[PDB]
Amino acid sequence: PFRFSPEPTLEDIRRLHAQFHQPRNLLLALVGEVGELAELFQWKSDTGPQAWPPKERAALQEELSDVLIYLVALAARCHVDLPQAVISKM
Amino acid sequence: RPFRFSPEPTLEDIRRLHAEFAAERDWEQFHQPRNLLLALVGEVGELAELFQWKSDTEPGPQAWPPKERAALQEELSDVLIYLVALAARCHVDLPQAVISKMDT
Amino acid sequence: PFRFSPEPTLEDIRRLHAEFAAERDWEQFHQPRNLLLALVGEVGELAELFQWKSDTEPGPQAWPPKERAALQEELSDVLIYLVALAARCHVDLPQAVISKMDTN
Amino acid sequence: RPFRFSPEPTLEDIRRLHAEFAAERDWEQFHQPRNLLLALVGEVGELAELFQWKSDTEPGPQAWPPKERAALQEELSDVLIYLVALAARCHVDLPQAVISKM
Numbered sequence A: 001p002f003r004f005s006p007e008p009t010l011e012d013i014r015r016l017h018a019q020f021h022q023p024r025n026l027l028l029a030l031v032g033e034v035g036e037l038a039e040l041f042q043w044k045s046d047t048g049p050q051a052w053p054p055k056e057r058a059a060l061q062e063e064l065s066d067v068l069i070y071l072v073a074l075a076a077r078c079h080v081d082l083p084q085a086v087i088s089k090m
Numbered sequence B: 001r002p003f004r005f006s007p008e009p010t011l012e013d014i015r016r017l018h019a020e021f022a023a024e025r026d027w028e029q030f031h032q033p034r035n036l037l038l039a040l041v042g043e044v045g046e047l048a049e050l051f052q053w054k055s056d057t058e059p060g061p062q063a064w065p066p067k068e069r070a071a072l073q074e075e076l077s078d079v080l081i082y083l084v085a086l087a088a089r090c091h092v093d094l095p096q097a098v099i100s101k102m103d104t
Numbered sequence C: 001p002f003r004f005s006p007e008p009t010l011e012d013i014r015r016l017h018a019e020f021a022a023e024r025d026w027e028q029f030h031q032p033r034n035l036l037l038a039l040v041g042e043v044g045e046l047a048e049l050f051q052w053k054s055d056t057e058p059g060p061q062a063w064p065p066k067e068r069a070a071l072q073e074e075l076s077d078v079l080i081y082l083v084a085l086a087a088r089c090h091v092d093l094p095q096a097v098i099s100k101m102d103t104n
Numbered sequence D: 001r002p003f004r005f006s007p008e009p010t011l012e013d014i015r016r017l018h019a020e021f022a023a024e025r026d027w028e029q030f031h032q033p034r035n036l037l038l039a040l041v042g043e044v045g046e047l048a049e050l051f052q053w054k055s056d057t058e059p060g061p062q063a064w065p066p067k068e069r070a071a072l073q074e075e076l077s078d079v080l081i082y083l084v085a086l087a088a089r090c091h092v093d094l095p096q097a098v099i100s101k102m
Ligand SMILES: *n1c(N)c(C)c[n+]([C@H]2C[C@H](O)[C@@H](COP(=O)(O)OP(=O)(O)OP(=O)(O)O)O2)c1=O
Pocket: C104, D018, D022, D027, D028, D029, D030, D031, D043, D046, D078, D081, D085
């Protein structure tokens, strides 16, 4: 069916990519990848990404992770328990 | 002191959670790619609407008034709740797509 | 096959938005970045409105006046920060435009 | 210090030109609200990448190297061009909706 791999956990990805990496420089880099990610959708239409050519799907996973990696970074530097902070909202 | 994230939820855990709260709030339908995308973009917006006034030569995020750091967490979450939501919808295994990256 | 008004103009807008701001001493906050994050914060409200639509659907002309009135706001707050950004960047936003089309 | 903008083209003018441009390479089909939003949401990113690595009270844009200062224009140019086409595609009076907000 569909499923995410049991790891790397949010804690791994935090440990793994970790001056640049200060607060608002990281927030501008998050918005950037959201900018690349948003680009792989602009000239589409309502119909999904599960059926895109390979070089596209491949970029769809690439840019998507990038965003995570920075959101990861940004929060791990704002000292927010990204993982827990999620369930609390639930 | 070392600041580390807790163990779980796993991204897979973060999925199976949002995955259900809506399936009870009957959402998944409007949950179409761009719909999910465009949302992530409003939260990202809501995320920057805290740093747009703060200068990086300021008390930094850690040292943010409770209610600010509170909002900050409630925001960093949603940006994650939708990133993982968009991924799953694309059939992307966000967790593994990260490894393929490390393969630099 | 539509039309904007002849005014205001971008300097006319770039002008008042000066007067306006630093009339709330809102000019001390026009440092490139703070400004860039502000655009992103408003570039995000604008999305929050289209996260529920689809382009196969009738543009905001059919939207209920209330939804169609809040769309004029964001579209306007987005141009305002964009202008406040360009200016602090000493960019002739108006020329930078046309002098970018004598190309692609 | 305090900068100005040439008296034209006006917001409407830009509107037409882009049209001619986009009416040339059959790009109107490409201009559906959400397209120009994401289209714009993304140029704001390219525009975000520029400053991501820069700094608070460091050199500063206007003192940036040429090729960067030039890329900067590009990026600001684009953001408008899309703001202008979405605004237009939504049948929204962009210049006037800016005063009405004062
Ligand atoms: N509208 C539509 N629908 C389309 C397809 C295209 N345009 C024009 C207007 C806009 O200014 C230009 C995009 O130019 P670009 O593709 O070179 O900018 P960018 O992609 O960011 O440069 P790069 O080569 O991708 O790095 O297309 C419409 O108005």
